[PDB]
Amino acid sequence: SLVLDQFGRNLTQAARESKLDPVIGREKEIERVMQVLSRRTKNNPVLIGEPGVGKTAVVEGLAQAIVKGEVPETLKDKHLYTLDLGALVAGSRYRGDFEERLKKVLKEIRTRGDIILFIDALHTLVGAAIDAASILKPMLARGELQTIGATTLDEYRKHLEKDAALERRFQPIQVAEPSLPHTIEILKGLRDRYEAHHRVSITDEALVQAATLADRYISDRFLPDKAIDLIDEAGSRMRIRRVAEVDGELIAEVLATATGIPVFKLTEEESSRLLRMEDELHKRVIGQVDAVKALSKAIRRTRAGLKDPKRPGGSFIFAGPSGVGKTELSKALAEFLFGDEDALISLDMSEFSEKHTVSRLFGSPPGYVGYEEGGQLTEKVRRKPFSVVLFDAVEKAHPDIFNSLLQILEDGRLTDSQGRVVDFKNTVIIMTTNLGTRDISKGFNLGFAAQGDTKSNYERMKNKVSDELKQHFRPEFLNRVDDVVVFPQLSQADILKIVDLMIDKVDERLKDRDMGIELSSSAKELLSKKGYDPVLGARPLRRTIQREIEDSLSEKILFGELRPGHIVVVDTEGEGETKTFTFRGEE
C-alpha cells in the first residue's frame, strides 16, 4: 500500500512506539465510539465539542486502546489511518493529479477491506482543491465507508446539519469540558514528558495553582490546553535564564506578565490597600462618605470570593442630581483598581435613543454592510477583560438597550451577531441616572417646617430612590443589581475642600509655562462663598473660580506683568460684600 502510506498516518504504529500523549479519565467517549460504530445504520461517528477539549486526543486515546488490545474482535485487525490532507495537497499541481491520487487512495481503501479512515477538521471536507468534497459524500451515501470525524459544535450545527444526504449516515457524540480534577490528572500525566523536554522540575502545588488560575482568571482559551500552555511557558522561562525548579509564585508571575495584569501578587500588601480603599478614594472624591463606603464594602466582598463567580464583579446604580460626583467616583475607581483612567470604558447612551441603533452595540446581522467588523462594545470588552464599564445617562436609551443589558446581569456573557461569546465576569458595571432625585434635589414640604434639615438620610433616600426606579424601570432589573447608591447634594464645608483640588489643577496649567499660583485662606473662603449653590453643587464653583482667577490672570499674562519663573499670590481686600481678589507677582 505505497499510495496509502504516502497519503495517510498510522496511529496504531505511533502508539506502538509511544509517539503519542498519554490519556487518562476519558474512556467514555471512546466506548461510545465503538458503541455507535457497531450499528448497521448511522455507524459513522462525529465528535462534537468545543475546540481544545481533546477530540484529537480522543482519537489518540482510541488508538492507544486498540493497540493495547482492550476492544472486542470486531475492531481488531483494523488499521487506523488519519487522512493526511497535507500529503495530498503537497506536490499536487499537475493538471489532473489532484483528485486522481485521491481516486487511487479511495480504491485502495475499498480494496483492502480491513481499514478505517479518520478525518480531522471535517469542515474542509463537507460543505466547503474544492471538488474533493463532492467525492466523499456519495461514498458515505453508499455506506461502505467507516470513518470517524471531529467538528466544532457551531460549525457542525451550521454546516453539517443542512447536509441531508449524510444525516442518515452520521451519529453525534458530545465531548464536554474537563473538570478541574480531570485537568489535574492530565497535568500529572504530562508532567513526565514536559519535564523531560524542558529539563526542569515541577511540583503538584504548581499544577493545582496553574489549573485554578487558568480556570478563574482566563476566559478566552479553555482549561484542557491553557494549563499546559502555562506550564510549558514557565518551563521555557526557566530554560532561557540559564537542576531547575518551578514553584507557585513563578507561574503566578508568568501569568501576570503574560495576559494583562490579572492579580500580579498573592501577598497581603494589596489587601492592606483594600483596607485603605476609602482613604484612597477620598483623595479625589469629597463628601460622599456613604457612596465610597458602600462601593468599598461591595468590592471587598467580591474580592473575598463571597460572590457568584458566574456573575460579574459588581453592579451599581449611581442615582443622584447633576454635578455631585457620579462620574468622578467612577474615574477614581478606575484609577484605583487598574492604575489608570484609560481602563474605564464609557458609553454615552444619549446616542442610543433609537432601537435600530442596537446593532452598533454588538454588530450587524450577517449579509449587511459593516458585518465584517464586530460590535463596538463586545470587541472592546474582549480586548480588555479587566475594565470598568460605565453607561452614562442610562435612562436616555431605548428599552431594547435594557433588554440586551440584563443578560450581562444574569449570566455575565454576551453573544454578538457573529456568534462569538464574550465574558463579563471580570468587569464592574456602573449605571448613572438622575431619576428618583426630584424630591431630594429640591424640597421644602407644604406647611410650616420646624428646625431640622437632618434625618436618617441615607436609608430613607435609598428606599425612596429604589421604589421610584422600580416604578420607572423593570423591577427584576433593579432586583438583580448588586447595589443602588444615592448621591446626596454637596454641603458647604466640603466645597471649601474641593476648591483646593481645583486650584491644584490651575497650578498644573501654570507649570507648563514655568509659573505658579498660591492662595491665602481668606481667598479660599471667598471662593467657597461665591461658588456655593446647593442645587447644582460643583460646576458653579468651577465657573466662579475661572471667572475670578483665570480671567484677569490671562490678561496679566498677555500684558506682561507675569513672566515665566514667577509666583502669583492671591489675597483678599475689603470686607463683607465689598471683598475683592488681589494678585501680586513675585519671584
Partner 1 sequence: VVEGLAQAIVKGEVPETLKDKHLYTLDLGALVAGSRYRGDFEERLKKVLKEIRTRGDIILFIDALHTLVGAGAAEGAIDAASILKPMLARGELQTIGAT
Ligand X SMILES: Nc1ncnc2c1ncn2[C@@H]1O[C@H](COP(=O)(O)OP(=O)(O)OP(=O)(O)O)[C@@H](O)[C@H]1O
CB of 55 to ligand ADP, least distance (A): 3
CB of 25 to ligand ADP, least distance (A): 7
Answer yes or no: is 56 a known binding residue.
yes
Q: Applying CB under 8 A, does 92 fall inside the site for partner 1? A: yes
Interacting partner of 186 out of ligand X, ligand ADP, Mg ion, none (Cβ under 5 to 8 A depending on kind): ligand ADP
Q: Applying CB under 8 A, does 266 fall inside the site for partner 1? A: no
**Single residue of 68, 142, 241, 356 touching partner 1 by CB under 8 A:** 241
Across the strands, what pairs with 171?
A: 45
Q: Applying CB under 6 A, does 324 fall inside the site for ligand X? A: yes
Helices (H), 241-276: 248-258, 269-275
Please state whether 550 falls in left (phi above 0), alpha (psi between -120 and 50) or beta: alpha
Answer yes or no: is 32 a known binding residue.
no
Amino acid sitting at position 554: S
CB 515 within 8 A of CB 567: yes
Torsion 97-98-100-104 (CA) sign? positive
Interacting partner of 92 out of Mg ion, a copy of itself, partner 1, none (Cβ under 5 to 8 A depending on kind): partner 1
Q: Applying CB under 8 A, does 253 fall inside the site for partner 1? A: no
What's the CA angle centered on 567, arms 561 and 572, to 5 degrees? 85
Q: Applying CB under 8 A, does 194 fall inside the site for partner 1? A: no
Q: Applying CB under 8 A, does 476 fall inside the site for a copy of itself? A: yes
**Single residue of 13, 16, 89, 167 touching partner 1 by CB under 8 A:** 89
Q: At what angle do helices 204-217 and 223-240 cross, to 10 degrees?
A: 120
Q: Applying CB under 6 A, does 285 fall inside the site for ligand X? A: yes
Torsion 40-41-45-49 (CA) sign? negative
Q: Applying CB under 6 A, does 328 fall inside the site for ligand X? A: yes
**DSSP designation for 160:** I
CB of 351 to partner 1, least distance (A): 31
Which CA distances in Å does 239 have to 188, 193, 197, 230, 494? 20, 15, 10, 14, 58
Site for a copy of itself in 371-410 (CB under 8 A): 399, 403
Site for ligand ADP in 189-218 (CB under 6 A): 189
User: How crowded is residue 565: how many other Cβ atoms within 10 Å of its Cβ?
Assistant: 10
CB of 291 to Mg ion, least distance (A): 14
Expressed in angstroms, the distance from the first to the final Cα of the chain is 96
- Strand-strand pairing, 427-433 and 483-486: unpaired
- Quick one: 198 or 425, whose CB is closer to ligand ADP? 198
**Single residue of 54, 312, 313, 323 touching ligand X by CB under 6 A:** 323
CB 284 within 8 A of CB 332: yes
Answer yes or no: is 460 a known binding residue.
no
Amino acid sitting at position 137: K
Q: Applying CB under 6 A, does 488 fall inside the site for ligand X? A: no
- Quick one: 237 or 326, whose CB is closer to Mg ion? 326
Q: Applying CB under 8 A, does 84 fall inside the site for partner 1? A: yes
Amino acid sitting at position 198: H
In the block, which residue shows the cell 524542558?
198
**Single residue of 147, 417, 434, 572 touching ligand X by CB under 6 A:** 434
Answer yes or no: is 443 a known binding residue.
no
Q: Applying CB under 8 A, does 348 fall inside the site for a copy of itself? A: yes
Region of 79-87, 221-229, 310-318, 467-475 interacting with partner 1 (CB under 8 A): 79-87
Interacting partner of 54 out of a copy of itself, partner 1, ligand ADP, none (Cβ under 5 to 8 A depending on kind): ligand ADP
Q: Applying CB under 6 A, does 209 fall inside the site for ligand X? A: no
Q: Applying CB under 6 A, does 119 fall inside the site for ligand ADP? A: no
- Quick one: 80 or 319, whose CB is closer to ligand X? 319
Q: Applying CB under 8 A, does 93 fall inside the site for partner 1? A: yes
Three-class DSSP category at 483: strand
CB 58 within 8 A of CB 186: no
Three-class DSSP category at 117: strand
Answer yes or no: is 101 a known binding residue.
no
Q: Give the list of residues 6+ apart from residue 111 with CB closer than 8 angstroms, or none.
A: none
Q: Applying CB under 8 A, does 98 fall inside the site for partner 1? A: yes
Region of 146-154, 322-330, 372-380, 442-450 interacting with ligand X (CB under 6 A): 322-330
Q: Shortest CA distance to 358 belongs to which of 367, 368, 345, 349? A: 349
Across the strands, what pairs with 246?
A: 202
CB burial of 444-453 (b: ≥16 within 10 Å; e: otherwise) equals: eeeeeeeeee
CB of 471 to ligand X, least distance (A): 13
Contact characters 227-256, ligand X, x per CB under 6 A = ------------------------------
Please state, in angstroms and rounded to a whole number, the distance separating the CA atoms of residues 584 and 541: 23
Grid coordinates belonging to 452:
431640622
Region of 143-151, 255-263, 432-440, 469-477 interacting with a copy of itself (CB under 8 A): 469-477
Three-class DSSP category at 368: coil
Q: Shortest CA distance to 81 belongs to which of 131, 155, 9? A: 9
Q: Which residues are annotated as a binding site?
A: 21, 24, 26, 52-57, 120, 142, 168-169, 286, 322-328, 392, 434, 480, 505, 539, 542
Binding site for ligand ADP (CB under 6 A): 21, 23, 26, 51-57, 186, 189, 224-225
Binding site for partner 1 (CB under 8 A): 84, 86-87, 89-93, 95, 98, 129, 239-242
Binding site for a copy of itself (CB under 8 A): 348, 350-351, 356, 369, 399, 403, 474-476
Q: Which residues are annotated as a binding site for ADP?
A: 21, 24, 26, 52-57, 142, 168
